[PDB]
Short mmCIF file of C-alpha atoms in Angstrom, two decimals:
data_model
loop_
_atom_site.label_atom_id
_atom_site.label_comp_id
_atom_site.label_asym_id
_atom_site.label_seq_id
_atom_site.Cartn_x
_atom_site.Cartn_y
_atom_site.Cartn_z
CA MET I 15 0.00 0.00 0.00
CA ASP I 16 2.41 2.67 -1.24
CA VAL I 17 1.36 6.07 -2.58
CA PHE I 18 3.35 7.88 -5.27
CA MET I 19 2.45 11.47 -6.16
CA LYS I 20 4.33 13.89 -8.43
CA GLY I 21 3.00 17.35 -9.20
CA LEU I 22 4.34 19.33 -12.16
CA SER I 23 7.48 17.42 -13.16
CA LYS I 24 8.69 20.02 -15.64
CA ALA I 25 11.98 19.85 -17.53
CA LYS I 26 13.52 22.30 -20.00
CA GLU I 27 17.00 21.71 -21.47
CA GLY I 28 17.55 19.37 -18.55
CA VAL I 29 16.55 16.11 -16.91
CA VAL I 30 13.91 15.44 -14.26
CA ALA I 31 14.59 11.89 -13.14
CA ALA I 32 13.00 9.95 -10.30
CA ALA I 33 13.43 6.34 -9.18
CA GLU I 34 11.39 5.09 -6.23
CA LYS I 35 11.75 1.87 -4.22
CA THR I 36 13.35 -0.16 -7.01
CA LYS I 37 15.03 -3.53 -6.67
CA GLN I 38 17.81 -4.47 -9.12
CA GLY I 39 20.04 -7.57 -8.80
CA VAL I 40 18.43 -8.48 -5.44
CA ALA I 41 18.17 -12.01 -3.97
CA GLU I 42 15.71 -12.73 -1.17
CA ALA I 43 15.18 -16.05 0.60
CA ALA I 44 12.79 -17.13 3.36
CA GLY I 45 12.19 -13.59 4.61
CA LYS I 46 9.07 -12.45 6.45
CA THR I 47 7.87 -8.84 6.40
CA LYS I 48 4.91 -7.22 8.14
CA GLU I 49 3.58 -3.67 7.72
CA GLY I 50 0.40 -2.49 9.41
CA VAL I 51 -0.61 -5.95 10.62
CA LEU I 52 -3.07 -6.48 13.47
CA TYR I 53 -3.67 -9.82 15.21
CA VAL I 54 -6.70 -10.00 17.52
CA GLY I 55 -7.40 -13.28 19.31
CA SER I 56 -5.85 -15.23 16.45
CA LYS I 57 -3.63 -18.30 16.22
CA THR I 58 -1.00 -18.98 13.57
CA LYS I 59 1.16 -22.07 13.10
CA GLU I 60 3.91 -22.53 10.53
CA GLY I 61 6.15 -25.42 9.52
CA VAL I 62 9.69 -25.50 8.20
CA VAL I 63 10.31 -22.77 5.61
CA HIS I 64 13.09 -23.65 3.16
CA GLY I 65 14.12 -21.13 0.52
CA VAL I 66 17.07 -20.54 -1.79
CA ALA I 67 17.65 -17.63 -4.19
CA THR I 68 20.39 -16.66 -6.63
CA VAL I 69 21.11 -13.74 -8.96
CA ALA I 70 24.19 -14.18 -11.16
CA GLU I 71 24.78 -11.82 -14.10
CA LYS I 72 27.96 -12.56 -16.07
CA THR I 73 27.87 -9.49 -18.27
CA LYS I 74 29.95 -7.04 -20.31
CA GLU I 75 28.98 -3.81 -22.07
CA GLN I 76 25.51 -3.47 -20.53
CA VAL I 77 23.44 -0.27 -20.44
CA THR I 78 20.68 -0.81 -17.87
CA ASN I 79 18.26 2.05 -17.11
CA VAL I 80 15.39 1.82 -14.65
CA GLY I 81 14.13 5.39 -14.95
CA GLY I 82 16.23 8.47 -15.52
CA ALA I 83 18.32 9.19 -18.58
CA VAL I 84 21.40 7.35 -19.87
CA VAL I 85 23.32 9.08 -22.67
CA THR I 86 26.33 7.06 -23.80
CA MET Y 25 3.00 1.51 3.44
CA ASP Y 26 5.38 4.20 2.22
CA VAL Y 27 4.30 7.61 0.90
CA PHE Y 28 6.28 9.44 -1.79
CA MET Y 29 5.35 13.04 -2.65
CA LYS Y 30 7.20 15.48 -4.91
CA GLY Y 31 5.84 18.94 -5.66
CA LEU Y 32 7.15 20.94 -8.61
CA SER Y 33 10.30 19.07 -9.63
CA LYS Y 34 11.49 21.69 -12.10
CA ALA Y 35 14.77 21.56 -14.00
CA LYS Y 36 16.29 24.03 -16.46
CA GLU Y 37 19.77 23.48 -17.94
CA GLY Y 38 20.35 21.13 -15.04
CA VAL Y 39 19.37 17.85 -13.42
CA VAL Y 40 16.75 17.14 -10.77
CA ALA Y 41 17.46 13.59 -9.67
CA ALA Y 42 15.89 11.62 -6.83
CA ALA Y 43 16.36 8.01 -5.74
CA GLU Y 44 14.34 6.73 -2.79
CA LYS Y 45 14.73 3.50 -0.80
CA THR Y 46 16.34 1.50 -3.61
CA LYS Y 47 18.04 -1.86 -3.29
CA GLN Y 48 20.80 -2.83 -5.74
CA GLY Y 49 23.15 -5.85 -5.45
CA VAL Y 50 21.49 -6.81 -2.14
CA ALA Y 51 21.25 -10.34 -0.66
CA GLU Y 52 18.80 -11.09 2.15
CA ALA Y 53 18.31 -14.43 3.90
CA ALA Y 54 15.93 -15.54 6.66
CA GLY Y 55 15.31 -12.01 7.94
CA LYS Y 56 12.19 -10.91 9.79
CA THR Y 57 10.96 -7.31 9.77
CA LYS Y 58 7.99 -5.72 11.52
CA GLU Y 59 6.64 -2.18 11.13
CA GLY Y 60 3.45 -1.04 12.84
CA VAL Y 61 2.47 -4.51 14.03
CA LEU Y 62 0.02 -5.08 16.89
CA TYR Y 63 -0.55 -8.43 18.61
CA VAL Y 64 -3.57 -8.65 20.92
CA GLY Y 65 -4.23 -11.95 22.70
CA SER Y 66 -2.68 -13.87 19.81
CA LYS Y 67 -0.44 -16.92 19.56
CA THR Y 68 2.19 -17.56 16.90
CA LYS Y 69 4.37 -20.63 16.41
CA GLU Y 70 7.12 -21.05 13.82
CA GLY Y 71 9.38 -23.92 12.79
CA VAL Y 72 12.92 -23.96 11.46
CA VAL Y 73 13.51 -21.21 8.88
CA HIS Y 74 16.29 -22.06 6.42
CA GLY Y 75 17.29 -19.51 3.79
CA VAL Y 76 20.23 -18.88 1.48
CA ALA Y 77 20.78 -15.96 -0.91
CA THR Y 78 23.51 -14.95 -3.35
CA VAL Y 79 24.19 -12.01 -5.66
CA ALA Y 80 27.27 -12.41 -7.88
CA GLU Y 81 27.83 -10.03 -10.80
CA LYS Y 82 31.01 -10.73 -12.78
CA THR Y 83 30.89 -7.65 -14.96
CA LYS Y 84 32.95 -5.18 -16.99
CA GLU Y 85 31.94 -1.94 -18.74
CA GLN Y 86 28.48 -1.64 -17.18
CA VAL Y 87 26.38 1.54 -17.07
CA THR Y 88 23.63 0.97 -14.49
CA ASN Y 89 21.20 3.80 -13.71
CA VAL Y 90 18.34 3.54 -11.24
CA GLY Y 91 17.04 7.10 -11.51
CA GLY Y 92 19.12 10.20 -12.07
CA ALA Y 93 21.20 10.95 -15.14
CA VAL Y 94 24.28 9.15 -16.44
CA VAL Y 95 26.18 10.91 -19.24
CA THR Y 96 29.21 8.92 -20.39
CA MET M 16 5.98 2.98 6.95
CA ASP M 17 8.34 5.70 5.73
CA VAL M 18 7.23 9.10 4.44
CA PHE M 19 9.19 10.97 1.75
CA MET M 20 8.23 14.56 0.92
CA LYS M 21 10.06 17.03 -1.34
CA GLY M 22 8.67 20.49 -2.06
CA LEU M 23 9.96 22.52 -5.01
CA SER M 24 13.12 20.66 -6.05
CA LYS M 25 14.29 23.31 -8.50
CA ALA M 26 17.57 23.21 -10.42
CA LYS M 27 19.06 25.70 -12.87
CA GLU M 28 22.54 25.19 -14.36
CA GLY M 29 23.14 22.82 -11.48
CA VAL M 30 22.19 19.52 -9.87
CA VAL M 31 19.58 18.78 -7.22
CA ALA M 32 20.31 15.23 -6.14
CA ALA M 33 18.77 13.23 -3.31
CA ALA M 34 19.26 9.62 -2.24
CA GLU M 35 17.26 8.31 0.71
CA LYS M 36 17.67 5.07 2.67
CA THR M 37 19.28 3.10 -0.15
CA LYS M 38 21.01 -0.25 0.14
CA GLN M 39 23.77 -1.19 -2.33
CA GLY M 40 26.16 -4.17 -2.01
CA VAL M 41 24.42 -5.20 1.26
CA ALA M 42 24.28 -8.73 2.71
CA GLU M 43 21.85 -9.51 5.53
CA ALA M 44 21.38 -12.86 7.25
CA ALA M 45 19.02 -14.00 10.02
CA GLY M 46 18.38 -10.49 11.32
CA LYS M 47 15.26 -9.42 13.19
CA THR M 48 14.01 -5.82 13.19
CA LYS M 49 11.03 -4.26 14.97
CA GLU M 50 9.66 -0.73 14.60
CA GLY M 51 6.47 0.38 16.33
CA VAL M 52 5.51 -3.10 17.50
CA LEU M 53 3.08 -3.70 20.36
CA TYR M 54 2.54 -7.07 22.06
CA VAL M 55 -0.47 -7.32 24.39
CA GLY M 56 -1.11 -10.63 26.15
CA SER M 57 0.44 -12.53 23.24
CA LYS M 58 2.70 -15.56 22.97
CA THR M 59 5.33 -16.16 20.29
CA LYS M 60 7.52 -19.23 19.77
CA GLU M 61 10.27 -19.61 17.18
CA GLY M 62 12.54 -22.46 16.12
CA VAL M 63 16.07 -22.47 14.77
CA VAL M 64 16.63 -19.71 12.21
CA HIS M 65 19.41 -20.52 9.74
CA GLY M 66 20.39 -17.95 7.12
CA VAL M 67 23.32 -17.29 4.80
CA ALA M 68 23.84 -14.35 2.43
CA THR M 69 26.55 -13.31 -0.01
CA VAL M 70 27.21 -10.35 -2.31
CA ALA M 71 30.28 -10.72 -4.54
CA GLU M 72 30.83 -8.32 -7.45
CA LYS M 73 34.00 -8.99 -9.45
CA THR M 74 33.86 -5.89 -11.61
CA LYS M 75 35.89 -3.40 -13.63
CA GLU M 76 34.86 -0.15 -15.35
CA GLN M 77 31.40 0.12 -13.78
CA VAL M 78 29.28 3.28 -13.64
CA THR M 79 26.54 2.68 -11.06
CA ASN M 80 24.10 5.49 -10.25
CA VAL M 81 21.24 5.20 -7.77
CA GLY M 82 19.93 8.75 -8.02
CA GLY M 83 21.98 11.87 -8.57
CA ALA M 84 24.05 12.65 -11.64
CA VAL M 85 27.14 10.87 -12.96
CA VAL M 86 29.02 12.66 -15.76
CA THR M 87 32.05 10.69 -16.93
CA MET O 23 -14.98 0.19 9.48
CA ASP O 24 -15.68 -1.66 12.73
CA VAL O 25 -15.43 -5.43 13.16
CA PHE O 26 -17.66 -7.33 15.60
CA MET O 27 -16.97 -11.02 16.27
CA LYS O 28 -18.58 -13.29 18.87
CA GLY O 29 -17.73 -16.98 19.11
CA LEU O 30 -20.00 -19.37 21.01
CA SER O 31 -22.30 -17.05 22.97
CA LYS O 32 -23.87 -19.80 25.05
CA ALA O 33 -26.38 -19.25 27.85
CA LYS O 34 -28.08 -21.75 30.16
CA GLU O 35 -30.39 -20.60 32.97
CA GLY O 36 -28.72 -17.23 32.62
CA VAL O 37 -28.19 -14.21 30.41
CA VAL O 38 -25.44 -13.50 27.88
CA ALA O 39 -25.86 -9.84 27.04
CA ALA O 40 -23.62 -7.62 24.92
CA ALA O 41 -24.01 -3.99 23.83
CA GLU O 42 -21.33 -2.47 21.61
CA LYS O 43 -20.75 1.17 20.67
CA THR O 44 -24.37 2.28 21.10
CA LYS O 45 -25.64 5.83 21.20
CA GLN O 46 -28.83 6.61 23.17
CA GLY O 47 -30.17 10.13 23.89
CA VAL O 48 -27.09 11.71 22.23
CA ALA O 49 -26.96 15.16 20.55
CA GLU O 50 -24.13 16.03 18.17
CA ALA O 51 -23.61 19.33 16.38
CA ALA O 52 -20.96 20.50 13.90
CA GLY O 53 -18.42 17.88 14.94
CA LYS O 54 -15.65 16.56 12.70
CA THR O 55 -14.12 13.11 13.15
CA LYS O 56 -11.31 11.40 11.26
CA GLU O 57 -10.11 7.80 11.56
CA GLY O 58 -7.45 6.36 9.27
CA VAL O 59 -7.37 9.36 6.95
CA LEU O 60 -4.43 10.10 4.65
CA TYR O 61 -3.92 13.38 2.78
CA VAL O 62 -1.22 13.38 0.08
CA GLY O 63 -0.63 16.61 -1.85
CA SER O 64 -4.27 17.59 -1.44
CA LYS O 65 -6.08 20.85 -0.76
CA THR O 66 -9.31 21.26 1.20
CA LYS O 67 -11.33 24.43 1.80
CA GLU O 68 -14.43 24.74 3.96
CA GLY O 69 -16.89 27.53 4.69
CA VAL O 70 -18.91 28.34 7.79
CA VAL O 71 -20.41 25.22 9.37
CA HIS O 72 -23.56 25.95 11.38
CA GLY O 73 -25.27 23.12 13.24
CA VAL O 74 -27.81 22.74 16.04
CA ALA O 75 -29.07 19.54 17.68
CA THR O 76 -31.54 18.71 20.44
CA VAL O 77 -32.75 15.57 22.21
CA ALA O 78 -35.59 16.14 24.69
CA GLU O 79 -37.54 13.17 26.08
CA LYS O 80 -40.30 14.13 28.53
CA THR O 81 -41.16 10.62 29.65
CA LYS O 82 -42.59 8.50 32.46
CA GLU O 83 -42.81 4.71 32.87
CA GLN O 84 -40.51 3.81 29.96
CA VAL O 85 -38.82 0.43 29.46
CA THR O 86 -36.07 0.94 26.87
CA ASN O 87 -33.82 -2.00 25.95
CA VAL O 88 -31.02 -1.83 23.39
CA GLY O 89 -29.73 -5.38 23.76
CA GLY O 90 -29.60 -7.40 26.94
CA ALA O 91 -32.59 -8.51 28.97
CA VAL O 92 -35.10 -6.41 30.90
CA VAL O 93 -37.44 -8.31 33.23
CA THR O 94 -39.87 -6.00 35.02
CA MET V 27 -11.99 1.48 13.02
CA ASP V 28 -12.66 -0.39 16.25
CA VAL V 29 -12.39 -4.16 16.66
CA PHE V 30 -14.60 -6.09 19.09
CA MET V 31 -13.88 -9.78 19.73
CA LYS V 32 -15.46 -12.08 22.33
CA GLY V 33 -14.58 -15.76 22.54
CA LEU V 34 -16.83 -18.18 24.42
CA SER V 35 -19.14 -15.89 26.41
CA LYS V 36 -20.69 -18.67 28.48
CA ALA V 37 -23.19 -18.16 31.29
CA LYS V 38 -24.87 -20.68 33.58
CA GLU V 39 -27.18 -19.57 36.41
CA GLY V 40 -25.53 -16.19 36.08
CA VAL V 41 -25.03 -13.14 33.88
CA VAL V 42 -22.29 -12.41 31.36
CA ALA V 43 -22.74 -8.74 30.53
CA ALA V 44 -20.53 -6.49 28.43
CA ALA V 45 -20.94 -2.86 27.37
CA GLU V 46 -18.28 -1.30 25.15
CA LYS V 47 -17.73 2.36 24.23
CA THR V 48 -21.36 3.43 24.68
CA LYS V 49 -22.65 6.98 24.81
CA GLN V 50 -25.84 7.76 26.76
CA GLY V 51 -27.19 11.25 27.60
CA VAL V 52 -24.16 12.83 25.86
CA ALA V 53 -24.04 16.29 24.23
CA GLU V 54 -21.22 17.20 21.84
CA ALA V 55 -20.73 20.52 20.07
CA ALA V 56 -18.10 21.73 17.59
CA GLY V 57 -15.54 19.12 18.60
CA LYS V 58 -12.76 17.84 16.35
CA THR V 59 -11.21 14.38 16.77
CA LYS V 60 -8.39 12.71 14.86
CA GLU V 61 -7.16 9.12 15.13
CA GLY V 62 -4.50 7.71 12.83
CA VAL V 63 -4.46 10.73 10.52
CA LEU V 64 -1.52 11.51 8.22
CA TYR V 65 -1.05 14.80 6.37
CA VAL V 66 1.65 14.85 3.67
CA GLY V 67 2.21 18.09 1.75
CA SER V 68 -1.44 19.04 2.18
CA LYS V 69 -3.26 22.29 2.89
CA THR V 70 -6.49 22.66 4.86
CA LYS V 71 -8.53 25.81 5.49
CA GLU V 72 -11.63 26.08 7.66
CA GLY V 73 -14.11 28.85 8.42
CA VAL V 74 -16.12 29.63 11.53
CA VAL V 75 -17.59 26.48 13.09
CA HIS V 76 -20.75 27.17 15.12
CA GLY V 77 -22.43 24.32 16.97
CA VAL V 78 -24.96 23.90 19.77
CA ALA V 79 -26.19 20.68 21.39
CA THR V 80 -28.64 19.82 24.16
CA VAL V 81 -29.83 16.66 25.91
CA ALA V 82 -32.67 17.19 28.39
CA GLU V 83 -34.59 14.19 29.77
CA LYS V 84 -37.34 15.11 32.23
CA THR V 85 -38.18 11.59 33.33
CA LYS V 86 -39.59 9.44 36.13
CA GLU V 87 -39.77 5.65 36.52
CA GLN V 88 -37.48 4.79 33.60
CA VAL V 89 -35.77 1.43 33.07
CA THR V 90 -33.03 1.97 30.47
CA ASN V 91 -30.76 -0.94 29.53
CA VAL V 92 -27.97 -0.74 26.96
CA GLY V 93 -26.65 -4.28 27.30
CA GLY V 94 -26.50 -6.33 30.46
CA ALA V 95 -29.47 -7.47 32.50
CA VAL V 96 -31.99 -5.40 34.45
CA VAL V 97 -34.31 -7.33 36.77
CA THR V 98 -36.75 -5.05 38.59
CA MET P 28 -8.95 2.83 16.52
CA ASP P 29 -9.60 0.93 19.74
CA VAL P 30 -9.30 -2.84 20.13
CA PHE P 31 -11.49 -4.80 22.55
CA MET P 32 -10.74 -8.48 23.17
CA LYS P 33 -12.30 -10.81 25.76
CA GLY P 34 -11.40 -14.49 25.94
CA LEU P 35 -13.63 -16.94 27.82
CA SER P 36 -15.94 -14.68 29.83
CA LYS P 37 -17.47 -17.48 31.88
CA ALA P 38 -19.97 -17.00 34.70
CA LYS P 39 -21.63 -19.55 36.98
CA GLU P 40 -23.94 -18.46 39.82
CA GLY P 41 -22.32 -15.07 39.50
CA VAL P 42 -21.84 -12.01 37.33
CA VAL P 43 -19.11 -11.23 34.80
CA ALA P 44 -19.59 -7.56 34.00
CA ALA P 45 -17.40 -5.29 31.90
CA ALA P 46 -17.84 -1.66 30.86
CA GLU P 47 -15.20 -0.07 28.64
CA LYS P 48 -14.67 3.60 27.74
CA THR P 49 -18.31 4.64 28.21
CA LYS P 50 -19.63 8.18 28.36
CA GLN P 51 -22.82 8.94 30.32
CA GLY P 52 -24.14 12.42 31.21
CA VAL P 53 -21.16 14.00 29.37
CA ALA P 54 -21.08 17.49 27.83
CA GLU P 55 -18.27 18.43 25.44
CA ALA P 56 -17.81 21.76 23.68
CA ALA P 57 -15.19 23.00 21.21
CA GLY P 58 -12.61 20.40 22.20
CA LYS P 59 -9.83 19.15 19.94
CA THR P 60 -8.25 15.71 20.34
CA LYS P 61 -5.42 14.07 18.41
CA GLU P 62 -4.17 10.48 18.66
CA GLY P 63 -1.50 9.11 16.34
CA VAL P 64 -1.48 12.14 14.05
CA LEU P 65 1.44 12.95 11.75
CA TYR P 66 1.89 16.26 9.92
CA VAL P 67 4.58 16.34 7.21
CA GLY P 68 5.11 19.59 5.31
CA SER P 69 1.46 20.51 5.76
CA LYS P 70 -0.39 23.75 6.49
CA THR P 71 -3.62 24.08 8.46
CA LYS P 72 -5.68 27.21 9.11
CA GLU P 73 -8.78 27.45 11.29
CA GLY P 74 -11.27 30.20 12.07
CA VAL P 75 -13.28 30.95 15.18
CA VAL P 76 -14.73 27.78 16.74
CA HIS P 77 -17.89 28.43 18.77
CA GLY P 78 -19.55 25.56 20.61
CA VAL P 79 -22.07 25.11 23.41
CA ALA P 80 -23.27 21.88 25.02
CA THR P 81 -25.71 20.98 27.78
CA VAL P 82 -26.87 17.80 29.52
CA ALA P 83 -29.71 18.30 32.02
CA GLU P 84 -31.60 15.28 33.38
CA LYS P 85 -34.36 16.17 35.85
CA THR P 86 -35.17 12.64 36.93
CA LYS P 87 -36.55 10.46 39.73
CA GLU P 88 -36.71 6.67 40.09
CA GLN P 89 -34.42 5.83 37.16
CA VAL P 90 -32.68 2.49 36.61
CA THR P 91 -29.96 3.07 34.01
CA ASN P 92 -27.66 0.18 33.05
CA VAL P 93 -24.89 0.41 30.48
CA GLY P 94 -23.54 -3.12 30.79
CA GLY P 95 -23.37 -5.18 33.95
CA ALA P 96 -26.33 -6.36 35.98
CA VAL P 97 -28.86 -4.31 37.95
CA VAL P 98 -31.16 -6.28 40.26
CA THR P 99 -33.61 -4.02 42.10
#
């Protein structure tokens, strides 16, 4: 539940770039997150949690652009 | 539950860049986070949590841009 | 639950850069965080937590930009 | 956005009564309430607010029952 | 945004009564309340707020019951 | 945003009563309350606030019960 607002992003002879909560080359395994969570008289059971992640880029001469400007 | 607001991002003969809570080349394993969490008369059980992560970039001549401007 | 506000980010013949709580080349394993967490008459049990993380960049001639400007 | 849950309300030779957030003989005028309200880059204007309320019961021998049991 | 939970309200040869956040004979005028309210880059204007309330019960021999048991 | 939890309210040859944040015979005028309120880069203007409240019960032989048991 994220809110993103941008009023009047004006650019003239320039660059108005903006990159929010971006993931790039990220490996996550068996993680638990909780935001704005309410438990009232509740029960929760959970067994073994097994997770494995991997991010392997073998790269050369890459131009990656998640938002913004790249002039090469 | 994050809120991102930007009013009048104006640029002229320049650069207005902005990068928020970005992850890049990040490895997370078996982590637990809690933000704004309320437990009321609740029970929670959890078994073994096994996690493994890996981020390996073998790279040369990379131009990565998550927001902003890159002029090369 | 983070709040990001920026009013009138104006740039002229210059650079207005901003990078918030960014992670880059970060390895986390079996960590527990708690922000604004309330326990009321609650029980919580947890088993063995096993985690392993790794971030290995073997790199040369990289131009990484998470927000801001990079002119090379 | 209220939640009301009742599990196994059992009664035997007795009374299981329950009255939640009830109003009775209540007068409200020109009040403003806000619960879980989020304003993001918003404008709000409001003129004169004129309100008048009145609750007048001229009564005798009344048996009022909002939930529960009344044995007279 | 209130939560009401009741597990196993059992009664035998007795009374299990419960009255939550009840108003009775209450007069409110020109009051402002705020619970869990977030303002982000917002403007709010408000004019004169005029309010008047009144609760007048001229009563005799009344049996009022908002939840619970009344045996008379 | 109030939370009300009750587990196993059992009664036998007795009384299990419970009254939470109840108002009765309460007069409020031009009051301002704030709970868990966050202002970020926000403006708020407010004019004259005029309020008047009144609670007048002229009563005899009243049996009022907001939760609990009344045996008369």
